[PDB]
């Protein structure tokens, strides 16, 4: 009652307040870094509860109405390339752009299939970018090597000029 969720981890049948940080239940932060003292309830089940949420880990021998008799299908299928491959049992080389789930949507009389865009899907765009990165790095390597050699030769010429000046000095 009063709608305070049971927190997983705290061992007491009462309601106590904690400083709920990020990545913890019973609290949705509104700002980066904010930690607000909420009120939760202990993991101990007591008479003070209003609803208790349970999950059927193993079905009994007789079914229930809005339950194991009836199933609700998963709303969205896999969207990433490898997720689709694993969920459809595809191999390393089968095409995935055709196995994609084509959910049918009808605006009145006009019907069309909306399939998810595939991410992490190898594409000539990605390969072109990879080749461009390789070309950029190798071009930079050639440029640095040639600049280093050029400055080495310039410094060698300057030191030769210094030696010539030393020879010219002292008559």
């Amino acid at each position: 009652k009063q709608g305070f969720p049971m927190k997983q981890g705290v061992l007491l049948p009462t309601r106590i307040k904690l400083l709920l940080t990020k990545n913890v239940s019973c609290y949705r932060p509104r700002r980066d870094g904010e930690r607000k003292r909420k009120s939760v309830r202990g993991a101990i089940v007591g008479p003070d509860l209003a609803v208790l949420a349970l999950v059927i880990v193993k079905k009994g021998e007789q079914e229930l109405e809005g339950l194991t008799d009836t199933t609700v299908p998963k709303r969205l299928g896999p969207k990433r390339a490898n997720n689709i491959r694993k969920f459809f049992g595809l191999s390393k080389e089968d095409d995935v752009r055709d196995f994609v789930i084509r959910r049918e949507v009808t605006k009145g009389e006009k019907t069309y299939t909306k399939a998810p865009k595939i991410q992490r899907l190898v594409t000539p765009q990605r390969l072109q970018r990879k080749r461009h990165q390789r070309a950029l790095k190798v071009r930079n390597a050639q440029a640095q090597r040639e600049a280093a050699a050029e400055y080495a030769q310039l410094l060698a010429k300057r030191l030769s000029e210094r030696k010539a000046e030393k020879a010219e000095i002292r008559k």
């Binding site: 600049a147 280093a148 050029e150 400055y151 310039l154 410094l155 300057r158």
Partner: protein, 258 residues
């Protein structure tokens, strides 16, 4: 003040921007860039108020975004880019080409140049070090860094930088005779030749500068910018050629050219 400041008011703006004091609360605060907040001309003030091309800041932004405008060799799209002392600003769509430079009164002039000179710029090398892997490098007054300079190039010299690619076209040393551009102090914009330096230890260095009309003055070395040979500038100078005549002489010139 518990962080960086992101606002500027009209009174606090530098005087050489020549913003009026009554049109708006704030001034265009320059973003971070090659030059300091002061002694730098934002593109919004170079267009809206200098060249009068755009009537409002929104139109300045539209000009900037359609990419008609490029400072140095690269296009700029930020509304308040800090274009500094010798930055070259193109405006290729109107085929003009300016190089920023101080008039003799001490303000950024609207001096126009040709592309054959805009293809380069100068920079007073402000520091020389050896970077990583033992590689020497120079850094100029606009934060621009050039690796592998000539060993003869030292601090207080000028390096000619091609806008196509950062590379030392040539350099001008700092010694007696070289024509210099006084960028800083009471002589903002004055041009002359060096007769001798002082070189105090610890304190600010001093240089004695005389001009074409033999008006000797003195300035800190932190405010000078050697720009060419004796009477042979490496750039084109605005009208007046960096000579400041007296107030009476200015009035006489105005009335004679009335």
């Amino acid at each position: 003040a518990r962080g960086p400041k992101k606002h500027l008011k009209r009174l606090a703006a530098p005087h050489h921007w020549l913003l009026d004091k009554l049109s708006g609360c704030y001034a265009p605060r320059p973003s971070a860039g090659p030059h300091k907040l002061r002694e730098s001309l934002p593109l919004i003030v170079f267009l809206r108020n200098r060249l009068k091309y755009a009537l409002n800041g929104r139109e300045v932004k539209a000009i900037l975004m359609q990419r008609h405008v490029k400072v140095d060799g690269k296009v700029r799209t930020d509304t308040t880019y800090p274009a500094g002392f010798m930055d070259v600003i193109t405006l290729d769509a109107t085929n003009e080409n300016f190089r920023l430079v101080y008039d003799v009164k001490g303000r950024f002039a609207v001096h126009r140049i040709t592309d054959e000179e805009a293809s380069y710029k100068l920079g007073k090398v402000k520091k020389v070090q050896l970077g990583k892997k033992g590689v020497p490098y120079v850094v100029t007054h606009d934060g621009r860094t050039i690796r592998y300079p000539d060993p003869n190039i030292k601090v207080n010299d000028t390096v000619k930088i091609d806008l196509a690619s950062g590379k030392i076209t040539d350099f001008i040393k700092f010694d007696a005779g070289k024509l210099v551009y006084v960028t800083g102090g009471r002589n903002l914009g004055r041009i002359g030749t060096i007769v001798h330096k002082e070189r105090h230890d610890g304190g600010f260095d001093l240089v004695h500068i005389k001009d074409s009309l033999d008006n000797t003055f003195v300035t800190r070395l932190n405010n000078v910018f050697v720009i060419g040979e004796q009477g042979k500038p490496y750039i084109s100078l605005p009208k007046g050629k960096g000579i400041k005549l007296s107030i009476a002489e200015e009035r006489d010139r105005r009335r004679a050219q009335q």
